[PDB]
Every structure is written in structure tokens, then in C-alpha cells.
Specification:
Chains A, B, C, D: It catalyses: Co-sirohydrochlorin + 2 H(+) = sirohydrochlorin + Co(2+); siroheme + 2 H(+) = sirohydrochlorin + Fe(2+). Chains A, B, C, D: Its EC number is 4.99.1.3, 4.99.1.4. Chains A, B, C, D: This is Sirohydrochlorin cobaltochelatase CbiKP. The structure is a homotetramer. Helices cover 42% and strands 16% of the residues of chain A. By secondary structure, chain A is an alpha/beta fold. Chain A folds into 2 domains: 138 residues, Rossmann fold (3-Layer(aba) Sandwich), CATH 3.40.50; 124 residues, Rossmann fold, CATH 3.40.50. A 4-stranded parallel β-sheet of chain A has the order 2-1-3-4, sandwiched between helices. In chain A, strands 6-5-7-8 form a 4-stranded parallel β-sheet. The relative contact order of chain A is 0.16.
């Protein structure tokens, strides 16, 4: 009988962003000092890029097949995703495919992504507030950039907006690909006549979307579009995995998944 | 090759509430005049009560097993649930269990519940507004009573609240068992100092929760608690399946599920 | 927690043959007096015929869906099939589809058909010998009519032939649809120059194949073809479920399946 | 859309035995010159030994996870097993676990092991005869050593014995772990009073069982036990994959599996 933990993120090949994930690995090791920890990545293109750099970057299926070969029997897979969207659901299907395979893993549990229950959503709103830069002043809006998805779990973003507004009317959620859109965010900012606006990723790592769509020099970045509107945009290139308060939520989900192995 | 449709609701044994579901059956027949329509119910206690009254009330598993015996080969199962919560997810698992069974159904698709994508959520908010009683005046709040759940899909309720507020600041979502709670709703009403408040179910049928928790004579009903606060509460005992605008959304989800059989 | 047994046969709509299955139901009740026993049938055409006669004849899927509705939690499904062929394999898939369904059965085990392990095959050969009519004389061949199948489990028939020959060189296996064929059986009989030959079904019940293909008045029956060869054919219209010795083997498989629920 | 073939054997770490599997790889390449061929092994201990020698030896799960990462979409998995026993069944479950995984393989078919249908069993008996050493004389028995298993598919061995005896009364099947046993084989040889007896593996490769249990210097080997009985034992250390006639059967099963991808 041999327990293991498999941490699974979307992943990033951005050098400057990868430390957020290393930090999570430290937290997990610190919380569970006697349980081996393994990594996988859900984005096929990030795995390609990492392999190109000479770095092992297993898919969840490669990682679980390898852990079965090492003789693990019970594995808690922790999603480092923000919402229970397409990546998370693919992860559940994969995990459950491995469970019970002849001579393989006995039990594979899966920890919820960040915005799990409405209780989690409320905890995330509280944690995001705790994570805000000390230099942000009262009344300066903060826009959290979620990925957005066509999947039904996109509803987690307007859901989170509800909880954030019960803390501070000037905290806003926008997404690259889903709802609310950045145009919705700009309309929110116009009604507030805000002159300085902070932008923080609502992704575990500050990857390509944070560096390019949120804060890029390109004309269509959020920071470029705000500057054209006469707003001083203040992008913060830190993923949510950098925050202890936000990280605690994934850590509790991992505790829950570990308990489900028993 | 033989196509069928299986309509699946939570269900109700309340005589006065069941017509909402009959209405849905009419709409579906009208839209798909050549495809047999069958019914099932996800709540084990409602099936027990209906059987007690001498009424057939198959589980999704009983219904699909019976349709396989009739020689259906491709069945679109339409969820008449509001959110993709525990009932919906149980329905997907069941549907997919039947698909491909030796000598049974070839393909079983499942239509999304009402609050599917963020696009659906936005359409639901628009449809709820279209459904409001003509006697409700501008500025009188309306509280939509969702069921609420411990499942992650509870986030659909604060999500819907976001879309409703982009239409009218005085439209509110509360739930019996999840978030937002009715205490959250009362705090919303207190800030608005509202003197007349409408209450509408955010369930397909106006069942036990609408008749007892929302509008009961008992002390803890929403209407009783509002009356104690000096508010004229105006409960509307109509499920969302009574609305043509709301029903259209489930009908489009059924179209989508039918298309997925091909 | 509620245990049930589901007995599953190919089935028959032949009035005179059905008592063999009733006998099995008695044996099972006698062995497991406190466990409810339910029936299903794997042949879609037999279920059609039985329903036509006004008799309930559930498919395995209908039966299990109904047992879930009665609140059974652990069900041992016993195959009353002779080989682990297509019907048995369809039964396993169905059983396993029901296991773990939300709010349904917790555990569904499946008992092996008659010719399970090589130890079972050897026990079957011994039991068939014990079942022979007292009037059959030493040296008179006995031909056991198996169904035969295109499935790989057809190999159970030549397998059983091996074990039967270690008991008596004049015991022969033939099949309607697989190998050995009846032409192979006739060649076996020609080398033996046998003048009187017994024919016994190697099916649980003496159904259509026993009454028509093995013993029919039609020209192509086994008894007709033997009579044309000058052989006195002595058909015995008793299914193997009539034999206590043969029945014990299915009963042990049911014990094994019951044990697997724990 | 990208087709691949995955050849899966029990495997061997015996240097002298591995060429039989290389031969199969050549045959497959020759038959399907444009389709990439990959290898996996079902025995966990053989994979351990091969890894110890610095050789990649993926499990079926490792191999399929890697092929998904290479962007294969349709993979025909060919079993190089002799019977549809526990290894084969584990292989089917694994193959089917990978099929349809999000962003992974679309279709994974599995080719039957050697003794598939009764038609295959008859073809195997014919192929074994074609494979016999030219020096074996008429009337000298040949004993084929199968592995044997507790699984129901052990019945394939007495089944094959039936077909072999329709070709030559002196061809015998024994197994290490199942039925018929080697003691059964010795009793067959005693009735024949045979003075010279050939021993051939009924495994794809002449691995540990062929080299040690069938032909070892140890007292309990088949060749040692025969020599004690005054029989000249003539072991042939060639696996069945060395035979063109036997190999053709696995090749047809691979054709069938390739066709099932369409
Ligand atoms: C707001 C949260 C969730 C939403 C909105 C949601 C919605 C959906 C939808 C739409 C599907 C159909 C497949 C697709 O549309 O791509 C699905 C399938 C499924 N869900 Fe969820 N789901 C949620 C959470 C969960 C969670 C937390 C679990 C964990 C057990 C789960 C388990 C499954 C499974 C096993 C399937 C089968 C289909 C698939 O993998 O996509 N769902 N869900
Ligand atoms: C001599 C005995 C058996 C033989 C020759 C055999 C052969 C096969 C074959 C050929 C398939 C592929 C599907 C098909 O060809 O129709 C299969 C599938 C399978 N077998 Fe067996 N099998 C045997 C016994 C068993 C037993 C006793 C079990 C009980 C666990 C089992 C479990 C399964 C399962 C779960 C599948 C998946 C595919 C299907 O349902 O047909 N098999 N087997
Ligand atoms: O990456 O969108
Ligand atoms: O019913 O809660
Ligand atoms: O019935 O063949
Ligand atoms: O290896 O037995
Ligand atoms: Co993106
Ligand atoms: Co309720
Ligand atoms: Co037949
Ligand atoms: Co062995
Ligand atoms: Na995000
Ligand atoms: Na990114
Ligand atoms: Na609701
Ligand atoms: Na209700
Ligand atoms: Na039979
Ligand atoms: Na019959
Ligand atoms: Na073998
Ligand atoms: Na070996």
C-alpha cells in the first residue's frame, strides 16, 4: 500500500512564471512530508514546449502510468486549476480511467480546483483581497483576469464577482475568453470614473495571458486599452499560487482528496 | 434506427404543480412531432409518492431500460433541472451507463439543464424578466428562490445574480439550501427599504419548496418572515416551466442533444 | 444494506421446458432462505414471447433498475448460461454498468456460467455422467448438444469433450452452431459403429434447440439424421438444470458471487 | 488522423528468447509498411528486469499514454498472448480505458490472442503440426507446453488438445500451472509406451518456463522427469512466434483489429 500525490497544473513554459508552481510543490511537501509528490500538466502545448527545452512534462495519463509502474496504489490528484471546467473534467476522466486497472492503481482521488463549492468561492474572494498589493488604495478598482471558457464552469467567474462585490464594490472580474468580458470590465470602470486600476491574474501562474493579454505592450492588451482611456493601469504579474491565502484553498482540497483514498 | 426523447425532471407529486411538466411535454411534442417522448424523475421520494398514487414514475435507469426493450437506438435525454448539480451529474452517469450496452441503446445524449453556459445564464436572466407578473412595479424587488445545493454547481446561483443585476438592480436570487441564503436576501431587501416584494420559484415546478418554504403559512416561510419585517410579500406559485421564454432555453438544449445523436 | 440475488437464464417460452428454471429457483431459495431472488432473461426474443403471453420477463437492465428502486444495495447475479460466451459477457457489462450508479446499487457481482474454470469443466463432465439415464448401457454413445457460438468461448465445447473422454470414450459433444459440429459427431459415431445413441441437451433447459434441432420430426433434426443412418436415436428432453449434480455447479458459482459482495 | 500498432507480448528478459519477438516485429512491419509499430509488455516482472538492463519496456498504459502524446488517434493493439486469459483481459481493459480520453486516443482496438475462436484453435493445431521439427518421426509423441492459468481461459488448452488429436493421436498438450497437467501428460505417454518424446513450447517465446520447467537440468523439469522414466526427451527451445505458420494467425488477428478502427 503506497500513497502518492499528483499535482496537476495547466502549466507554463514561461521561465519567470514557473516559480509559482515550485512554491506550491514546497507547500505540499511541507504539509505532507512523508508522501511522494509527482507533477503533470494538462495543456498539450505547454508539455510540447517543456519537452522542447529538455524538461520532462508528463501528461496526467503519462504520470499516472508511471506512478502505477513505481507501485503506487492510492494517488490523490490535486487540480491546480481555477474552475471545474474542461481541463478539470478531462483530469477527472483520466484519473478515473486509471483507477482499478488490472495490476495498477487501486484508488485515484481528485481534489477540487480553486472555485469549487460556493463556500470555496467565498473563501477565494477573501483570499484575493488578502493578496492585494499594499500600494493599492481604497477605491482603486482591481480587475482579476480569469481565463474564461466555453464550458458551463465559466459561470464561476460571474459567481466569484458576486462574492467579491460583497467585500468591495470596486473589485471586478474579467476574462480573456468567457464572461464577464473585458468590454464588460471597461463599462464597469467607466461608471466608476476610475483613474488608477490594478490588474491581477486569476490564474495559478502569471503565464502567457497575464504577460501578453493582460499586461502586453501590444495594442490589444488590457493595460494598453486602459492607457488609451487615460487610466493608469497597474498590472501585477503574480499568479494566485504565489499567495499563501489563495494556496491554502488548494491545500485544503488536497487534504480532502487524501481523505477520500481511505 | 429509432430515435426517442426522454424528459427528466426532479419531479413533483403535488397535483397543482404537475401541469407545468405537462406543458413542457406539449412544447416538446410540438417541436418534435415525429419523435416518441418518454418521462423519468430523478428524486427517489417523488417516484415513491407517485407510485403510491398508482402513477408510473420511472427512474432514469427504469425508463432507459424500458426504451431499450422497445427497440429505441438513439435517445436524447433532456434535463429539466435548473443547474448542473448532483441530480444532473447522476443523470449523465446513468445515461452514459446505458449507452453501448450489448443489444441495447447505441447512443444516449444528455441536454444541459437551464443554467448551462454563461450564454445560457444571460438568457435565463432575460427570460425571468420576461416572465415577471405584469402587476409588479418598477423598483419592487423580486426574489427568485433556487433550490441550492452542496454541489459545486451552487455557484450557478450567485452567477445568475450577476446577470440579473445587469438587467435590474432589484432582482435578487436566494436559495433554500445553498448560497445566496435567505438571510443574504433579507439583508439585500433591508438596504433597499423595500415595502413590497415578489417571490418566484427558480425551479421548473412550483413544488414543495415553493408552496412551503417560499410561501407557506408556517413561521419560517419566506413570506412569513417578510410579513414579520412589515413587507407585503407577493408569492407567485408558478414554476419556470410555465414560462414560454424560460422553456425555450430547455428546448434549445434538447435540440442540441438531438443533434449530438447524429 | 440489502442483499438480493438475480438469476439470469437465456430463457424459454416453451411451457414444458420452464419447470427446469423453476427447479433452479427452488434450489436457490433452499440454499439462501433469507435472500430475495429475482429473475431476468438474456434472449430479447424470449422476453418478447413471454410478454406476449402476459408474463413479466425483464431484461437484466430492467431487473437491475427495478431492484435499485426496491432499495437493494448488493446484488449477486448468477448466470444460468453454459459457457462464458456473448450472453454471459453482455451480462457482465450490464451488471457492471449498474454498479455504483448514483443512488443505485453499491455492488453487483456476477457468478460464472457452468463451464467456468478447467476445474468446473471437469466437474461438469462428472455431473453429466451422473445425470445419464439409467437405461443407457455401457458403450452406447451419448451426444450432448451444446448451443455453439461464434464467440471465442465456443472453445468450451471441445474443452468439455476432452474431460468427458477421460471418463468414457463414448461420450461426445456436438453443437448446433459452433464446434464440434453435428457432422463431426456423425463421423465419431461412424467409427464407433454405434447402433443406439442417446442425445441430451447441454443447455440449462430443453428448449427450442432440444425439441426441434436435436429431437424434431423434421428431416434435419439430429434424431432424423441418425434414423436415416440406421441408428436408434434416444433423445432425452431434459435440460441440465434438471440435474442435481449439474445444478450444484451453478449453486457454487452463486456462493462465490455472494462472497464477492463482501 | 494517425494510425499506430501496439504489439504486446507477455515479454521475456532472456537474451536468447527475445529474437522470436523481433521476428514478429519484422513480420508486422512487412505486412503494414506505412503504420508505426510500438511495443509493450504485460508482465510487471519482465518490465522490471528489462529496465534493469537499461532497456525501455513500457507497460500497456505507459505505451498508450506515450502514443497519445505523439498524436496517434487510432491504435490497433495486438495481443501476442496464446489464450484470452488474465493478461489478455487486463490488456482489453487498459486499451478501452484509453479510448475516448479527453484530447487522447479516439479508438483503441484489440487483436485476439492466438487461440481465439474455435476456427483459430483449429488453425493453431494445423500450424503447430507444420512447425514440428523434421527429425520427429511418425508416432513419436510431441508435448506442447502451455503456461496454464487459474482463469477460465485455461479451457483453451484441453480445447486445443481436441483439435490436435483430430490431426495426430500422439500430439499432447500439457501446462505448467493449469490443465492438462504434466502428470496427465505422463499418463498419456505411459499408455503410448513412447520411447522418444519431443517437447515444444506453446508460448510465443521460449522463455523461463521453456528453459527451466520444460527443459531444465533441475530434477523437476519435464525433460528430467521423462529421462527418469527411460524416455529420450527432445526439447525444442523455439517459441511459437518463430513459426511462420503460427505467426500468420496473430497477423490475421492484427488485420482484424486494424479493420475495427474504421
Ligand atoms: C460548476 C461546476 C460544474 C459544472 C458547471 C459542470 C458541468 C458539466 C457538464 C456540462 C458536463 C458535460 C460534458 C461537457 O459539457 O463538457 C459535465 C460532465 C461531468 N462532470 Fe461536471 N460540472 C461541474 C462540476 C463537476 C465536478 C466538481 C465533478 C467531480 C466529480 C464533476 C463530474 C463530472 C463527470 C464525471 C462528467 C462526465 C462528462 C465529462 O467528463 O465532461 N462535474 N459536467
Ligand atoms: C473462455 C473464457 C473467456 C473467453 C474465451 C473470453 C474472450 C473474450 C473476448 C473475445 C472478448 C472481446 C469481446 C468479444 O470478443 O465479444 C472478451 C471481453 C471481455 N471479457 Fe472475456 N472471455 C472469457 C471469460 C471472461 C470472464 C469469465 C470474465 C469475467 C470477468 C470476462 C470478462 C470480460 C470483460 C469485462 C470483457 C470486455 C468486452 C466484452 O464484454 O465482450 N471474460 N472476452
Ligand atoms: O491560449 O488561449
Ligand atoms: O427537500 O429539501
Ligand atoms: O436460435 O438459433
Ligand atoms: O512464472 O510462473
Ligand atoms: Co487561453
Ligand atoms: Co430540497
Ligand atoms: Co440458437
Ligand atoms: Co508462469
Ligand atoms: Na482562470
Ligand atoms: Na496562460
Ligand atoms: Na433551482
Ligand atoms: Na420542491
Ligand atoms: Na450450451
Ligand atoms: Na433453445
Ligand atoms: Na501458453
Ligand atoms: Na516464461
Amino acid at each position: 500500500q503506497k500513497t502518492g500525490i499528483l499535482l496537476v497544473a495547466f502549466g507554463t513554459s514561461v521561465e519567470e512564471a514557473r516559480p509559482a508552481l515550485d512554491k506550491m510543490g514546497d507547500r505540499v511537501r511541507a504539509a505532507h512530508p512523508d508522501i511522494p509528490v509527482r507533477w503533470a500538466y494538462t495543456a498539450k502545448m505547454i508539455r510540447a514546449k517543456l519537452r522542447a527545452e529538455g524538461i520532462a512534462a508528463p501528461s496526467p495519463a503519462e504520470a499516472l502510468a508511471g506512478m502505477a509502474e513505481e507501485g503506487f496504489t492510492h494517488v490523490a490528484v490535486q487540480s491546480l486549476h481555477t474552475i471545474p471546467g474542461e481541463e478539470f473534467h478531462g483530469l477527472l476522466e483520466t484519473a478515473h480511467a486509471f483507477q482499478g486497472l488490472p495490476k495498477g492503481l487501486t484508488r485515484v482521488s481528485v481534489g477540487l480546483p480553486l472555485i469549487g463549492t460556493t463556500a470555496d468561492a467565498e473563501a477565494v474572494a477573501e483570499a484575493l483581497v488578502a493578496s492585494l498589493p499594499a500600494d493599492r488604495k481604497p477605491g482603486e478598482p482591481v480587475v482579476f483576469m480569469g481565463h474564461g471558457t466555453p464550458h458551463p464552469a465559466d459561470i464561476c467567474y460571474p459567481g466569484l464577482q458576486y462574492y467579491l462585490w460583497r467585500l468591495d464594490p470596486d473589485l471586478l472580474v474579467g476574462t480573456v475568453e468567457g464572461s464577464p468580458s473585458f468590454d464588460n470590465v471597461m463599462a464597469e470602470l467607466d461608471v466608476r470614473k476610475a483613474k488608477r486600476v490594478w490588474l491581477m491574474p486569476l490564474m495559478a501562474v502569471a503565464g502567457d495571458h497575464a504577460r501578453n493579454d493582460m499586461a502586453g505592450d501590444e495594442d490589444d492588451s488590457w493595460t494598453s486599452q486602459l492607457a488609451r482611456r487615460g487610466i493608469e493601469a497597474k498590472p501585477v504579474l503574480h499568479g494566485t499560487a504565489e499567495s499563501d491565502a489563495v494556496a491554502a484553498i488548494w491545500l485544503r482540497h488536497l487534504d480532502d482528496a487524501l481523505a477520500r483514498l481511505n
